[PDB]
Design a protein around this motif. Structure first.
Motif, PDB file in Angstrom:
ATOM      1  N   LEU C   6       0.823  -1.204   0.000  1.00  0.00           N
ATOM      2  CA  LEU C   6       0.000   0.000   0.000  1.00  0.00           C
ATOM      3  C   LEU C   6       0.857   1.254   0.000  1.00  0.00           C
ATOM      4  CD1 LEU C   6      -3.065   0.174   2.287  1.00  0.00           C
ATOM      5  CD2 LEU C   6      -1.884   2.285   1.822  1.00  0.00           C
ATOM      6  N   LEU C  10       1.267   4.399  -3.056  1.00  0.00           N
ATOM      7  CA  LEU C  10       1.265   5.833  -2.846  1.00  0.00           C
ATOM      8  C   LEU C  10       2.578   6.461  -3.287  1.00  0.00           C
ATOM      9  CD1 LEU C  10      -0.472   7.386   0.174  1.00  0.00           C
ATOM     10  CD2 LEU C  10       1.720   8.281  -0.432  1.00  0.00           C
ATOM     11  N   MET C 117      -9.965  23.534  -8.040  1.00  0.00           N
ATOM     12  CA  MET C 117      -9.604  24.725  -7.289  1.00  0.00           C
ATOM     13  C   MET C 117      -9.362  25.922  -8.203  1.00  0.00           C
ATOM     14  SD  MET C 117      -5.746  23.658  -6.182  1.00  0.00           S
ATOM     15  CE  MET C 117      -6.187  21.986  -5.753  1.00  0.00           C
ATOM     16  N   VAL C 128     -10.822  38.854  -4.623  1.00  0.00           N
ATOM     17  CA  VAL C 128      -9.808  39.835  -4.250  1.00  0.00           C
ATOM     18  C   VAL C 128     -10.463  41.121  -3.758  1.00  0.00           C
ATOM     19  CG1 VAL C 128      -7.880  41.192  -5.162  1.00  0.00           C
ATOM     20  CG2 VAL C 128      -8.100  38.806  -5.730  1.00  0.00           C
ATOM     21  N   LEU C 135     -12.537  47.918  -1.735  1.00  0.00           N
ATOM     22  CA  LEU C 135     -11.599  48.961  -2.098  1.00  0.00           C
ATOM     23  C   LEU C 135     -10.388  48.311  -2.761  1.00  0.00           C
ATOM     24  CD1 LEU C 135      -9.227  49.034   0.464  1.00  0.00           C
ATOM     25  CD2 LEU C 135     -11.294  49.823   1.639  1.00  0.00           C
ATOM     26  N   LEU C 136      -9.318  49.097  -2.938  1.00  0.00           N
ATOM     27  CA  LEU C 136      -8.053  48.670  -3.535  1.00  0.00           C
ATOM     28  C   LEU C 136      -8.259  48.163  -4.959  1.00  0.00           C
ATOM     29  CD1 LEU C 136      -5.102  48.695  -3.169  1.00  0.00           C
ATOM     30  CD2 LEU C 136      -5.215  46.396  -2.293  1.00  0.00           C
TER      31      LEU C 136
ATOM     32  N   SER D  19     -10.389  55.197  -4.583  1.00  0.00           N
ATOM     33  CA  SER D  19     -10.516  55.280  -3.137  1.00  0.00           C
ATOM     34  C   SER D  19     -10.366  56.695  -2.625  1.00  0.00           C
ATOM     35  CB  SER D  19      -9.476  54.389  -2.454  1.00  0.00           C
ATOM     36  OG  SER D  19      -8.165  54.860  -2.713  1.00  0.00           O
ATOM     37  N   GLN D  20      -9.685  57.568  -3.362  1.00  0.00           N
ATOM     38  CA  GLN D  20      -9.600  58.977  -3.021  1.00  0.00           C
ATOM     39  C   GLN D  20     -10.964  59.630  -3.198  1.00  0.00           C
ATOM     40  OE1 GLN D  20      -8.112  61.432  -1.188  1.00  0.00           O
ATOM     41  NE2 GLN D  20      -6.203  60.995  -2.275  1.00  0.00           N
ATOM     42  N   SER D  21     -11.295  60.560  -2.311  1.00  0.00           N
ATOM     43  CA  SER D  21     -12.548  61.283  -2.434  1.00  0.00           C
ATOM     44  C   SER D  21     -12.383  62.497  -3.346  1.00  0.00           C
ATOM     45  CB  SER D  21     -13.059  61.713  -1.059  1.00  0.00           C
ATOM     46  OG  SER D  21     -13.389  60.585  -0.268  1.00  0.00           O
TER      47      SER D  21
ATOM     48  N   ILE E   6      -9.392  60.486   4.471  1.00  0.00           N
ATOM     49  CA  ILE E   6     -10.505  59.621   4.107  1.00  0.00           C
ATOM     50  C   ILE E   6     -10.133  58.212   4.549  1.00  0.00           C
ATOM     51  CG2 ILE E   6     -11.972  58.825   2.244  1.00  0.00           C
ATOM     52  CD1 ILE E   6     -12.226  61.763   2.837  1.00  0.00           C
ATOM     53  N   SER E   8     -11.360  55.365   3.485  1.00  0.00           N
ATOM     54  CA  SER E   8     -11.302  54.457   2.349  1.00  0.00           C
ATOM     55  C   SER E   8     -10.047  54.681   1.522  1.00  0.00           C
ATOM     56  CB  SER E   8     -12.544  54.620   1.481  1.00  0.00           C
ATOM     57  OG  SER E   8     -12.559  55.884   0.851  1.00  0.00           O
ATOM     58  N   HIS E   9      -9.606  55.933   1.391  1.00  0.00           N
ATOM     59  CA  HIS E   9      -8.364  56.177   0.671  1.00  0.00           C
ATOM     60  C   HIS E   9      -7.153  55.742   1.476  1.00  0.00           C
ATOM     61  CE1 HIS E   9      -5.385  57.920  -1.949  1.00  0.00           C
ATOM     62  NE2 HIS E   9      -4.889  58.589  -0.923  1.00  0.00           N
ATOM     63  N   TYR E  11      -6.972  53.234   3.690  1.00  0.00           N
ATOM     64  CA  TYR E  11      -6.878  51.781   3.662  1.00  0.00           C
ATOM     65  C   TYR E  11      -6.532  51.247   2.284  1.00  0.00           C
ATOM     66  CZ  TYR E  11      -8.769  51.549   8.361  1.00  0.00           C
ATOM     67  OH  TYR E  11      -8.952  51.673   9.715  1.00  0.00           O
ATOM     68  N   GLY E  12      -6.775  52.023   1.230  1.00  0.00           N
ATOM     69  CA  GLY E  12      -6.310  51.619  -0.085  1.00  0.00           C
ATOM     70  C   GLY E  12      -4.801  51.681  -0.195  1.00  0.00           C
ATOM     71  N   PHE E  15      -3.416  48.773   2.488  1.00  0.00           N
ATOM     72  CA  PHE E  15      -3.542  47.362   2.160  1.00  0.00           C
ATOM     73  C   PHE E  15      -2.998  47.019   0.783  1.00  0.00           C
ATOM     74  CE2 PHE E  15      -7.420  47.470   5.101  1.00  0.00           C
ATOM     75  CZ  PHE E  15      -6.607  47.242   6.193  1.00  0.00           C
ATOM     76  N   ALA E  16      -2.283  47.950   0.145  1.00  0.00           N
ATOM     77  CA  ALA E  16      -1.905  47.774  -1.259  1.00  0.00           C
ATOM     78  C   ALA E  16      -0.912  46.640  -1.519  1.00  0.00           C
ATOM     79  CB  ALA E  16      -1.417  49.109  -1.833  1.00  0.00           C
ATOM     80  N   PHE E  19      -2.084  42.726  -1.463  1.00  0.00           N
ATOM     81  CA  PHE E  19      -2.960  42.160  -2.477  1.00  0.00           C
ATOM     82  C   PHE E  19      -2.360  42.219  -3.871  1.00  0.00           C
ATOM     83  CE2 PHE E  19      -6.132  43.159   0.797  1.00  0.00           C
ATOM     84  CZ  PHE E  19      -6.792  41.955   0.856  1.00  0.00           C
ATOM     85  N   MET E  24      -1.378  35.518  -0.925  1.00  0.00           N
ATOM     86  CA  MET E  24      -2.542  35.281  -0.082  1.00  0.00           C
ATOM     87  C   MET E  24      -3.151  33.916  -0.372  1.00  0.00           C
ATOM     88  SD  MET E  24      -5.978  37.619   0.356  1.00  0.00           S
ATOM     89  CE  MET E  24      -6.519  37.440  -1.334  1.00  0.00           C
ATOM     90  N   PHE E  25      -3.111  33.494  -1.629  1.00  0.00           N
ATOM     91  CA  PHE E  25      -3.672  32.222  -2.058  1.00  0.00           C
ATOM     92  C   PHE E  25      -2.759  31.039  -1.767  1.00  0.00           C
ATOM     93  CE2 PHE E  25      -6.115  34.755  -5.447  1.00  0.00           C
ATOM     94  CZ  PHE E  25      -7.088  35.049  -4.515  1.00  0.00           C
ATOM     95  N   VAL E  32      -5.569  22.107   0.502  1.00  0.00           N
ATOM     96  CA  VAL E  32      -5.825  20.913  -0.292  1.00  0.00           C
ATOM     97  C   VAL E  32      -4.817  19.828   0.045  1.00  0.00           C
ATOM     98  CG1 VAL E  32      -5.954  19.990  -2.603  1.00  0.00           C
ATOM     99  CG2 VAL E  32      -6.901  22.207  -2.111  1.00  0.00           C
ATOM    100  N   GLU E  36      -5.525  16.219   1.214  1.00  0.00           N
ATOM    101  CA  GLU E  36      -5.200  15.044   0.408  1.00  0.00           C
ATOM    102  C   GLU E  36      -4.267  14.099   1.145  1.00  0.00           C
ATOM    103  OE1 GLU E  36      -6.521  14.271  -2.553  1.00  0.00           O
ATOM    104  OE2 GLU E  36      -7.703  16.117  -2.559  1.00  0.00           O
ATOM    105  N   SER E  43      -6.704   6.646   5.336  1.00  0.00           N
ATOM    106  CA  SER E  43      -6.989   5.453   4.557  1.00  0.00           C
ATOM    107  C   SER E  43      -5.815   4.486   4.517  1.00  0.00           C
ATOM    108  CB  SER E  43      -7.387   5.839   3.139  1.00  0.00           C
ATOM    109  OG  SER E  43      -7.609   4.689   2.351  1.00  0.00           O
ATOM    110  N   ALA E  44      -4.581   4.981   4.651  1.00  0.00           N
ATOM    111  CA  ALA E  44      -3.439   4.075   4.698  1.00  0.00           C
ATOM    112  C   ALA E  44      -3.441   3.262   5.978  1.00  0.00           C
ATOM    113  CB  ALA E  44      -2.126   4.844   4.575  1.00  0.00           C
TER     114      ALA E  44
END
Lengths: 49, 49, 146, 97, 49, 97, 49, 48
Positions: C6, C10, C117, C128, C135-136, D19-21, E6, E8-9, E11-12, E15-16, E19, E24-25, E32, E36, E43-44
């Motif tokens: 076995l 594998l 996947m 993303v 954002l971003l 993102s800038q206003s 701002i 939102s600006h 955090y852009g 966080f640049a 991403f 990240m992936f 997996v 696996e 099972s072995a």
């Protein structure tokens, strides 16, 4: 009527065995995207006697 | 085919059966190019006689 | 013995977890198959002879030639190159060559593992953006990607 | 003269980032020069990139929903290069309050 | 906090770089291969058991 | 064997199944004949050679609009002269080879 | 014997000519143009191309 | 990615044939005598 793609058919798709769409459809634009600076344009627009 | 005795070597047929070389034969051009040394050593001396 | 057997199965499976990469297909200009799209290798030229028993020369009635005479001529090379874009590489060729049924089954379920996947860029531009809380700035081009 | 062979689309670096206003002053002059040089270009999606880049900057002061699916008002002007992605508020200004 | 900021600006720009890459992936790919192995190691044993 | 309808005087000559790659090397040297004979600088006919499937029937450029309105401009070649002399040479070959 | 422009008396001429040898010599070097560079020798032609 | 052909069962020549030039000539026929490698193994025993 705004153009999504511009293709060149080597053969009509009714007669196209092994269907091969044009390489131009890979790009987002229908033609070659040429980046232009808008600040360099608006100076040329607002001068120019 | 070689036959392991005093029997003569004989040639394969289009119906996939060994047939004797002595007699008239037809080669297509595709078979002659892939059996050149087989032609020159077995059936071509049976042509020179 | 059951644990050792076995464990090598594998060793057998994880060694076969690869992707069958397509290669170049040259037309058989010679008279052996006469235009069947055989696969030239050019990294191991010895491998071409062992790949394709249909291209064997059968000089004498060998015991191997007793077998290889029965090989059908159109069972060689590719059959349907599923191409999409002219000038771009085809995504999925379909060829006949020397291959065991088991290692192929390990590989076809490995692409099915890798397809399991995979998400197209319509979905991953949301992932993303949602991992960044919308954002971003993220820009996907809306065009074909074969 | 050579449209269909090359389009002189607006540069990526001159869109104000989404993102800038709008209250940030160098972002709107970046949008002012974008709108004036809008019709100069040969991009057919340039009316929508002009409309969206201003709509990126006033997201919270002008929160309109956009009818293209999966996509929002923080989605940049760089994206809108396809006709089905044009906002119906831009297609019909009577949908905008 | 700075007055003309701002959220939102900010955090852009904040966080640049985390991403920009697909790193990240990478932990999403680890899930997996951990699975696996975990199904097979269950099972072995249980087939030897 | 199929595709575009041409007169076939040379059809009795042996020729294997010319695929897309083998037709490109036909297109490499037909272009190399016309570049040598007329001495064109530049590249007149090698987009058919360098990529894609060279087995053409009738070239036509088309632009696809968003509303499904694809319009296609078929451009057949006009009265060809050198090919009209070549069809004489092909048919004269089969009796004077 | 096919020898193109053998009696030409022009100012110049094209660099694309066909000068077949007489049939006492090997006329094989004019039927190796398209699919014969590389593998083939300087004495034979491919009957399939 | 695998460029080469995907099999794991090679066709190994286990016992070679009797090379001989003195007696019983013509019973065996290799592809090496025609400067060609055989697709299939050549010998007495060829274990998969």
């Amino acid at each position: 009527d705004v153009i999504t793609n511009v293709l060149v058919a080597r053969v009509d798709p009714a007669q196209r065995g092994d269907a091969a769409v044009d390489i131009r459809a890979t790009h987002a634009t229908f033609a070659a995207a040429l980046p232009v600076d808008p600040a360099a344009i608006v100076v040329a627009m607002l001068c120019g006697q | 085919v070689p036959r392991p005795n005093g029997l003569e070597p004989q040639l394969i047929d289009d119906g996939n059966v060994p047939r004797d070389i002595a007699g008239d034969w037809v080669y297509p051009s595709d078979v002659l190019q892939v059996s050149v040394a087989v032609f020159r050593d077995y059936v071509w001396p049976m042509v020179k006689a | 013995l059951r644990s050792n057997v076995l464990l090598m199965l594998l060793q057998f499976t994880l060694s076969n977890l690869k992707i069958n990469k397509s290669s170049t297909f040259t037309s058989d200009v010679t008279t052996i198959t006469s235009g069947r799209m055989i696969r030239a290798f050019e990294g191991r030229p010895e491998l071409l002879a062992l790949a394709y028993p249909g291209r064997a020369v059968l000089p004498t009635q060998t015991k191997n030639a007793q077998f290889l005479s029965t090989a059908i001529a159109d069972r060689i090379g590719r059959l349907d190159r599923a191409n999409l874009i002219g000038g771009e590489v085809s995504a999925m060729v379909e060829c006949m060559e020397l291959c065991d049924a088991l290692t192929l089954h390990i590989r076809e379920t490995y692409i099915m593992l890798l397809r399991s996947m995979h998400q197209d860029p319509t979905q991953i531009v949301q992932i993303v953006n949602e991992c960044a809380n919308n954002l971003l700035n993220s820009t996907i081009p809306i065009s074909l990607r074969p | 003269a050579y449209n269909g062979l090359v389009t002189t689309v607006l540069s990526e670096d001159a869109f104000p980032d989404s993102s800038q206003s709008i209250t940030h002053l160098p972002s709107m002059w970046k949008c002012l020069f974008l709108t004036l040089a809008g019709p100069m270009t040969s991009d057919p999606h340039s009316p929508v990139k002009v409309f969206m880049a201003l709509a990126n900057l006033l997201a919270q002061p002008e929160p309109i929903a956009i009818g293209v699916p999966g996509m929002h008002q923080t989605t940049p002007a760089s994206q809108f290069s396809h006709p089905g992605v044009w906002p119906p508020g831009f297609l019909n200004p009577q949908l905008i309050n | 906090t700075e007055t003309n900021l701002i959220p939102s600006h900010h955090y852009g720009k904040a966080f640049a770089p985390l991403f920009a890459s697909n790193a990240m992936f990478t932990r999403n790919q680890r899930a997996v291969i951990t699975r696996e192995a975990f199904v097979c190691a269950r099972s072995a044993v249980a087939q030897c058991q | 064997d199929a595709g575009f309808l041409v007169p076939r005087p040379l059809d009795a000559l042996r020729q294997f199944d010319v695929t897309s790659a083998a037709a490109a090397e036909i297109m490499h040297a037909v272009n190399d004949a016309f570049k040598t004979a007329f001495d064109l600088d530049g590249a007149l006919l090698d987009g058919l050679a360098l990529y894609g499937d060279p087995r053409i029937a009738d070239l036509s450029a088309a632009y696809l609009q968003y509303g499904g309105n694809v319009v296609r401009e078929h451009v057949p070649p006009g009265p060809s002269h050198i090919h009209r002399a070549l069809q004489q040479v092909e048919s004269t070959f089969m009796a004077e080879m | 014997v096919c020898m193109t422009n053998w009696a030409s008396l022009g100012d110049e001429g094209r660099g694309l000519e066909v000068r077949l040898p007489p049939p006492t010599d090997s006329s094989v070097h004019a039927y190796k143009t398209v699919l014969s560079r590389g593998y083939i020798d300087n004495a034979q032609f491919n009957p399939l191309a | 990615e695998d460029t080469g052909l995907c099999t794991s069962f090679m066709l190994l020549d286990n016992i070679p044939s009797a090379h001989l030039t003195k007696e019983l000539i013509g019973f065996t026929w290799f592809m090496q005598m025609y400067q060609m490698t055989p697709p299939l193994p050549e010998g007495a025993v060829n274990r998969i």
